[PDB]
Design a binder for this molecule. Structure first.
Ligand SMILES: C/C=C1\C(=C\C2=NC(=C\c3[nH]c(/C=C4\NC(=O)C(CC)=C4C)c(C)c3CCC(=O)O)/C(CCC(=O)O)=C2C)NC(=O)[C@@H]1C
Ligand SMILES: [Cl-]
Length: 230
């Protein structure tokens, strides 16, 4: 029933929107048309809205020529403003996420964080915790929004932060929860990681622990999360 499923999508219950979206996408032209109209009425986003990310990504994931063409033409930069306090280009990150190429997205994200930190970090290819503390909130919001919107809320530093808070800020409890350690065994980069949505909540983006937790803690304590309601 397309009418009733459309109504379910346009009602205000997030949980019921998500089941309606999944059903509509499998209902051919009529269902896909309802989803395309939902994007037209809700994109560009101002604030991240999970259901809108799910509509976009569900349609991309069909990998059908005409839908993909239409999405690229109407939403060439995706659904979320690609804003940066340093003029950085986040389109390649968006493109990797829209293709569900999470490994490429992780690599791009790591490079962009060094670019954001400046020439010293770009040169050495790793961060100091004080550089993280000084990141502009806007860039972290753009980066996180893309991860979250393109992963059904499963990925993003905001997701890790809330799991870290749920763990009493105990990093040794966080690592197993996000799949980065299994008992005594550290998940080996890159081959040990799960580069798809079967991964546990918070699995990506990665934060190497070779130089300790200081970068991750500074990232999770950054004012961006409270500022933007993450
Ligand atoms: C021995 C055990 C450890 C270890 C070793 C190590 N990691 C390396 C690289 C590297 N690991 C990650 C990610 C992770 N690696 C993990 O184990 C985990 C689970 C917490 C994550 C999430 C990324 C993204 C890069 C590329 C970016 C970068 O190099 O920073 C290198 C090569 C260093 C080099 O060649 O210079 C070495 C030797 N890393 C650790 O976390 C533990 C304690
Ligand atoms: Cl550090």
């Amino acid at each position: 029933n397309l009418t009733e499923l459309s109504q379910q999508l346009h009602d205000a219950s997030e949980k019921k929107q998500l089941t309606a979206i999944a059903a509509l996408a499998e209902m051919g032209e009529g269902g896909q048309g309802i989803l395309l109209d939902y994007l037209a009425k809700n994109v560009p986003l101002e604030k991240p809205v999970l259901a809108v990310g799910n509509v976009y990504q569900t349609l991309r994931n069909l990998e059908q020529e005409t839908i993909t063409t239409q999405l690229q033409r109407n939403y060439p930069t995706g659904i979320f403003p690609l804003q940066s306090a340093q003029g950085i280009d986040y389109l390649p990150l968006q493109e990797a996420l829209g293709s569900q190429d999470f490994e490429t997205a992780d690599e791009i994200t790591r490079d962009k964080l060094c670019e954001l930190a400046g020439p010293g970090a770009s040169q050495r290819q790793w961060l100091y915790f004080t550089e993280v503390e000084k990141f502009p909130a806007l860039d972290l919001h753009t980066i996180n929004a893309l991860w979250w919107l393109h992963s059904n809320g499963n990925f993003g530093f905001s997701v890790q932060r809330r799991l870290w808070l749920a763990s009493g800020k105990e990093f040794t409890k966080l690592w197993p929860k996000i799949g980065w350690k299994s008992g005594n065994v550290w998940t080996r980069w890159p081959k040990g990681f799960t580069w798809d949505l079967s991964a546990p909540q918070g699995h990506l983006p990665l934060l190497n622990q070779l130089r300790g937790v200081r970068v991750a803690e500074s990232l999770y304590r950054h004012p961006v999360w409270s500022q933007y309601g993450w």
